[PDB]
Design a protein around this ligand. Structure first.
Ligand code: HEM
Length: 112
């Protein structure tokens, strides 16, 4: 689902905190090239909130459906999927429009 060309547009909403290119810098949040189908806490050089390390132990991978639920409300996400009530997220920013989420995901799928 999802037009990865409208997705690239929406993605401009993430660029204050993230980069997209291969080898890219960790600005505020980790670079997101390669994120699709990859583990939670997927970048080794970024210091993630403990809650992402605990999704990653569980074997959570960034599927279409877990990116969908995440980018709707990261903080509810990380509580939910970690099982740790004291779960923190530094993200905070959410997408609320369904078309947007679907399109953004379709454009994450083209970055490896
Ligand atoms: C639609 C726009 C964005 C998308 C697609 C995006 C996607 C994601 C993804 C998939 C992760 C987790 C990667 C991992 O588990 O390895 C993440 C982490 C994070 N994002 Fe974003 N994000 C977006 C916008 C933002 C913006 C606007 C901010 C800052 C205001 C930001 C800050 C962060 C931070 C700080 C983390 C790490 C969280 C922590 O360890 O607590 N993100 N992002």
């Amino acid at each position: 689902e999802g037009d990865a060309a409208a997705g690239e547009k929406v993605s401009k909403k993430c660029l204050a905190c993230h980069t997209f290119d291969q080898g890219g810098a960790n600005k505020v949040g980790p670079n997101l090239f390669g994120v699709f189908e990859n583990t939670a806490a997927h970048k080794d050089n970024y210091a993630y909130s403990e809650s992402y390390t605990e999704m990653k132990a569980k074997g959570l991978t960034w599927t279409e459906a877990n990116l969908a639920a995440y980018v709707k409300n990261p903080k509810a996400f990380v509580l939910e999927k970690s099982g740790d009530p004291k779960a923190k997220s530094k993200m905070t920013f959410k997408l609320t429009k369904d078309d947007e989420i679907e399109n953004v995901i379709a454009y994450l799928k083209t970055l490896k």
